[PDB]
Structures are given as structure tokens and as C-alpha cells.
């Protein structure tokens, strides 16, 4: 009970890179740490999952 357009939207949604940012970047904190997450998929298994 599925359509092709929904499939395309689903695959496009779950294969986008994310820009997180920085913690401690106007703040009085003595540490400045960048934040990174998992973005684009690489292998065939991840695409099939």
C-alpha cells in the first residue's frame, strides 16, 4: 500500500548531512567544543536498512 513518491521522499529525508554547531562558542565557559553527528550513508547495507 505504498507509492513511489513517498519512497523518494523517505530516501531523500534519511540521507542528509546535519550541521550541529558548537558548545561554548558570548558565553563565559572556558571550553569551546564542536559537535558532530552521523550524516550521509556510505555502504550498500546502510542504504538497504
Amino acid at each position: 500500500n505504498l507509492t513511489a513518491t513517498e519512497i523518494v521522499n523517505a530516501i531523500r529525508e534519511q540521507n542528509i548531512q546535519v550541521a550541529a554547531g558548537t558548545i561554548g562558542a558570548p558565553s563565559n565557559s572556558p571550553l569551546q567544543l564542536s559537535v558532530n553527528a552521523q550524516g550521509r550513508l556510505t555502504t550498500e547495507q546502510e542504504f538497504a536498512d
Binding site: G24, S27, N28, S29, P30, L31, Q32, L33
Partner: protein, 50 residues
């Protein structure tokens, strides 16, 4: 003897042409100097400011 002296001087020139160190442009003064400060990694801008 003049020819021998000339040959000796030519040899001396060839020998002395190899002892001077090389270079391109001498380092002169341009009325200013630079100073770098490096903090431990992860430091905020306030510490560098101070």
C-alpha cells in the same frame, strides 16, 4: 713566471669561489616585528584576550 703566476691566481679564484655561503636576499629591518601566542587547545577567546 708571469704565466705561471696567472695560472696560480686562476686556480686560487676557482678554489675561493666555493667557500662563500650562498643566499638570495639579506634580512633587513622594516621597523616592526611579530609575536605569536598559542593557548592550550580548546581555550575560549576570553583567555586569549587576557
Amino acid at each position: 713566471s708571469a704565466m705561471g703566476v696567472y695560472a696560480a691566481l686562476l686556480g686560487l679564484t676557482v678554489g675561493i669561489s666555493y667557500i662563500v655561503p650562498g643566499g638570495f636576499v639579506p634580512a633587513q629591518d622594516k621597523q616592526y616585528l611579530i609575536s605569536f601566542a598559542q593557548l592550550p587547545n580548546g581555550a575560549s577567546l576570553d583567555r586569549t584576550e587576557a
